[PDB]
Design an enzyme around this catalytic site. Structure first.
Site, PDB file in Angstrom:
ATOM      1  N   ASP B  25       0.867  -1.224   0.000  1.00  0.00           N
ATOM      2  CA  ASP B  25       0.000   0.000   0.000  1.00  0.00           C
ATOM      3  C   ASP B  25       0.890   1.257   0.000  1.00  0.00           C
ATOM      4  O   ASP B  25       1.289   1.734   1.087  1.00  0.00           O
ATOM      5  CB  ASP B  25      -0.832   0.002   1.230  1.00  0.00           C
ATOM      6  CG  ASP B  25      -1.886   1.087   1.235  1.00  0.00           C
ATOM      7  OD1 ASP B  25      -1.804   1.899   0.274  1.00  0.00           O
ATOM      8  OD2 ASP B  25      -2.733   1.036   2.167  1.00  0.00           O
ATOM      9  N   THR B  26       1.106   1.797  -1.177  1.00  0.00           N
ATOM     10  CA  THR B  26       1.946   2.995  -1.264  1.00  0.00           C
ATOM     11  C   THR B  26       1.273   4.206  -0.642  1.00  0.00           C
ATOM     12  O   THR B  26       2.043   5.186  -0.387  1.00  0.00           O
ATOM     13  CB  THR B  26       2.331   3.269  -2.710  1.00  0.00           C
ATOM     14  OG1 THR B  26       1.138   3.513  -3.486  1.00  0.00           O
ATOM     15  CG2 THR B  26       3.111   2.200  -3.364  1.00  0.00           C
ATOM     16  N   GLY B  27      -0.010   4.214  -0.392  1.00  0.00           N
ATOM     17  CA  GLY B  27      -0.652   5.262   0.322  1.00  0.00           C
ATOM     18  C   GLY B  27      -0.567   5.234   1.807  1.00  0.00           C
ATOM     19  O   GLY B  27      -1.151   6.118   2.496  1.00  0.00           O
TER      20      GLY B  27
HETATM   21  C1  LIG Z   1      -6.560   1.023   4.483  1.00  0.00           C
HETATM   22  C2  LIG Z   1      -6.486   0.674   2.994  1.00  0.00           C
HETATM   23  C3  LIG Z   1      -6.855  -0.769   2.711  1.00  0.00           C
HETATM   24  C4  LIG Z   1      -7.493   1.489   2.188  1.00  0.00           C
HETATM   25  N1  LIG Z   1      -7.215   2.914   2.069  1.00  0.00           N
HETATM   26  C5  LIG Z   1      -6.007   3.325   1.335  1.00  0.00           C
HETATM   27  C6  LIG Z   1      -4.796   3.580   2.198  1.00  0.00           C
HETATM   28  O1  LIG Z   1      -3.673   3.664   1.352  1.00  0.00           O
HETATM   29  C7  LIG Z   1      -4.863   4.886   3.003  1.00  0.00           C
HETATM   30  C8  LIG Z   1      -4.723   6.155   2.152  1.00  0.00           C
HETATM   31  C9  LIG Z   1      -4.825   7.289   3.134  1.00  0.00           C
HETATM   32  C10 LIG Z   1      -3.759   8.161   3.251  1.00  0.00           C
HETATM   33  C11 LIG Z   1      -3.766   9.210   4.159  1.00  0.00           C
HETATM   34  C12 LIG Z   1      -4.886   9.442   5.012  1.00  0.00           C
HETATM   35  C13 LIG Z   1      -5.964   8.612   4.859  1.00  0.00           C
HETATM   36  C14 LIG Z   1      -5.926   7.525   3.962  1.00  0.00           C
HETATM   37  N2  LIG Z   1      -3.718   4.855   3.886  1.00  0.00           N
HETATM   38  C15 LIG Z   1      -3.852   4.605   5.198  1.00  0.00           C
HETATM   39  O2  LIG Z   1      -4.924   4.392   5.792  1.00  0.00           O
HETATM   40  O3  LIG Z   1      -2.623   4.575   5.869  1.00  0.00           O
HETATM   41  C16 LIG Z   1      -2.610   4.716   7.301  1.00  0.00           C
HETATM   42  C17 LIG Z   1      -1.476   3.814   7.699  1.00  0.00           C
HETATM   43  O4  LIG Z   1      -0.285   4.566   7.488  1.00  0.00           O
HETATM   44  C18 LIG Z   1      -0.634   5.981   7.752  1.00  0.00           C
HETATM   45  O5  LIG Z   1      -0.202   6.775   6.645  1.00  0.00           O
HETATM   46  C19 LIG Z   1      -1.381   7.197   5.915  1.00  0.00           C
HETATM   47  C20 LIG Z   1      -2.529   7.199   6.926  1.00  0.00           C
HETATM   48  C21 LIG Z   1      -2.129   6.062   7.829  1.00  0.00           C
HETATM   49  S1  LIG Z   1      -8.405   3.947   2.263  1.00  0.00           S
HETATM   50  O6  LIG Z   1      -7.870   5.261   2.375  1.00  0.00           O
HETATM   51  O7  LIG Z   1      -9.189   3.361   3.291  1.00  0.00           O
HETATM   52  C22 LIG Z   1      -9.260   3.835   0.865  1.00  0.00           C
HETATM   53  C23 LIG Z   1     -10.200   2.823   0.699  1.00  0.00           C
HETATM   54  C24 LIG Z   1     -10.883   2.705  -0.500  1.00  0.00           C
HETATM   55  C25 LIG Z   1     -10.630   3.625  -1.528  1.00  0.00           C
HETATM   56  N3  LIG Z   1     -11.291   3.560  -2.716  1.00  0.00           N
HETATM   57  C26 LIG Z   1      -9.680   4.634  -1.389  1.00  0.00           C
HETATM   58  C27 LIG Z   1      -9.043   4.754  -0.187  1.00  0.00           C
END
Ligand SMILES: CC(C)CN(C[C@@H](O)[C@H](Cc1ccccc1)NC(=O)O[C@H]1CO[C@H]2OCC[C@H]21)S(=O)(=O)c1ccc(N)cc1
Lengths: 99, 99
Positions: B25-27
């Protein structure tokens, strides 16, 4: 381009004549933007992320430029703490993960 | 490996003698697992997230095998709808996004 992951993989986008930044997110099935006006018809959708839930508007066949590449697809509008480019649109760029 | 993104980028992990799957998960800045026992001390953390907030346990210096590669780093334990491998650990794999 090739990018490494020591920093967040943020790119510039252009959508509906407005410029924003967004995170290239292989964990996201769909693209979700918050800070944007789209014209036309849309449908309610609920998406599920770590923290629970968020209610979004689904816009279909939205023209979007991502790091210079023009594509069309689905864009969700709703509260997200960061604008996210999901796999729906990354596949259009022929993006891959490599290790 | 190289993978494309028409499907979710799921890999096998081994942690604490337990086998699981997780999304690359690059996000995600940090790695977050739900379905897993870790020994030892840990600290409370809130991480943020798309539909709000989740309260997690932070475990430091956790040995983990991701798609066969041994690394050590921080692992967060808490409710997530999907086990996710974040950039903290993908940088240890030398992962890149390419397009
Ligand atoms: C939890 C994942 C399976 C799903 N998500 C994408 C995810 O990459 C989010 C993307 C993301 C990024 C920033 C803020 C909220 C969500 N990142 C995230 O929750 O990471 C958390 C863990 O490391 C920390 O760094 C980022 C927030 C913390 S999500 O944001 O829930 C999501 C779900 C479905 C869609 N269509 C789009 C986004």
């Amino acid at each position: 381009p090739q990018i490494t992951l020591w920093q967040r993989p943020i790119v510039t986008i252009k959508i509906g004549g407005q410029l924003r930044e967004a995170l290239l997110d292989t964990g996201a099935d769909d693209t979700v933007l918050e800070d944007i006006d789209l014209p036309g018809r849309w449908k309610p959708k609920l998406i599920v992320g770590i923290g629970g839930f968020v209610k979004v508007r689904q816009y279909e066949q939205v023209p979007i430029e991502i790091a210079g590449h023009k594509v069309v697809g689905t864009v969700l509008i709703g509260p997200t703490p960061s604008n996210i480019i999901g796999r729906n649109l990354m596949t259009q760029l022929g993006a891959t993960l490599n290790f």
